[PDB]
Design a protein around this ligand. Structure first.
Ligand SMILES: O=C(O)c1cc(C(F)(F)F)ccc1NCCc1[nH]nc2ccccc12
Length: 278
């Protein structure tokens, strides 16, 4: 092959990912997985500092070559579990991810499957969106983590909006703050009911049309809503305000990435350097 393998980075949703070096000396992430070939190639001209760079597409099996980053946010949260990620670093990462999402969404690209282990970090303080769930959206063929899935997806919405990524990022924000997953369900209905028990069972008042969702059942239990002071306790009122807007049930009420960037929570945002053990 044109690539000397270094290690298997892991198993994505679409296939294996390897750390490999180009035999240019470049160290890359090599993901293994037409007419979609045209769409995927468009993404390569679209670049943003908070999106992992797609270097090459090769159909011969489908291969995607990405820039390599040494650690993901899931590993960093685990490493930081005794102390917690410092709030200025949580704030910088959230701000950067919202910048990345605002870029994607302005180009009508959804991520669809945001989770800590798809968020890649470097020693310089950057964080970048990786492992986009774009196969289905492009028509590409061939245990799932549901913890970050928006409620309209779980209720069988046929068309996703950009709001699904804001929901996921809100769940990630909460987990960075509390050091524990916000909604750790193990089935679609367990995920849904974990959301309902915390945020209240949605009705037509807070979510017009929810009772017409394909998978909505009138026999859903009716749980009342808790208080965000209980949900992410340490977080100040600016962060709790922003989080509540990223977790609105109604996708139309849920804050956009660009509006979130103007939220007062980010008035004092900085770019700290993380302590990384590689
Ligand atoms: O991330 C992956 O694994 C991945 C998988 C596939 C598929 F083949 F599975 F469909 C396609 C693209 C993939 N990433 C594209 C990253 C990217 N570059 N520029 C972008 C601008 C805006 C939004 C995203 C952008």
């Amino acid at each position: 092959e044109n690539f000397q393998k270094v290690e298997k980075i892991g198993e994505g949703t679409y296939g294996v990912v390897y750390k490999a070096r180009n035999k240019t000396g470049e160290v890359v992430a090599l993901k293994k997985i037409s007419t979609a070939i045209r769409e995927i190639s468009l993404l390569k001209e679209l670049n943003h500092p908070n999106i992992v760079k797609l270097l090459d597409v090769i159909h011969t099996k489908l291969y995607l070559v990405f820039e390599f980053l040494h650690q993901d946010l899931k590993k960093f949260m685990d490493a930081s579990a005794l102390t917690g990620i410092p709030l200025p670093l949580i704030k910088s990462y959230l701000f950067q991810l919202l910048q990345g999402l605002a870029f994607c969404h302005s180009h009508r690209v959804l991520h669809r499957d945001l989770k800590p282990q798809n968020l890649l970090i470097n020693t310089e303080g950057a964080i970048k969106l990786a492992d986009f769930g774009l196969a289905r959206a492009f028509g590409v063929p061939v245990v799932v983590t549901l913890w970050y899935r928006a409620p309209e997806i779980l209720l069988g919405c046929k068309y996703y909006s950009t709001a699904v990524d804001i929901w996921s990022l809100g769940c990630i924000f909460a987990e960075m703050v509390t050091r524990r997953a916000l909604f750790p369900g193990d089935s679609e209905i367990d995920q849904l009911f974990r959301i309902f028990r915390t945020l209240g069972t949605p009705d037509e008042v807070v979510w017009p049309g929810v009772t017409s969702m394909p998978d909505y059942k009138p026999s859903f239990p009716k749980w009342a809503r808790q208080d965000f002071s209980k949900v992410v306790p340490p977080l100040d009122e600016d962060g709790r305000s922003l989080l509540s807007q990223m977790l609105h049930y109604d996708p139309n009420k849920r804050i956009s990435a660009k509006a979130a960037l103007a939220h007062p929570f980010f008035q004092d945002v900085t770019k700290p350097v993380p302590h990384l053990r590689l």
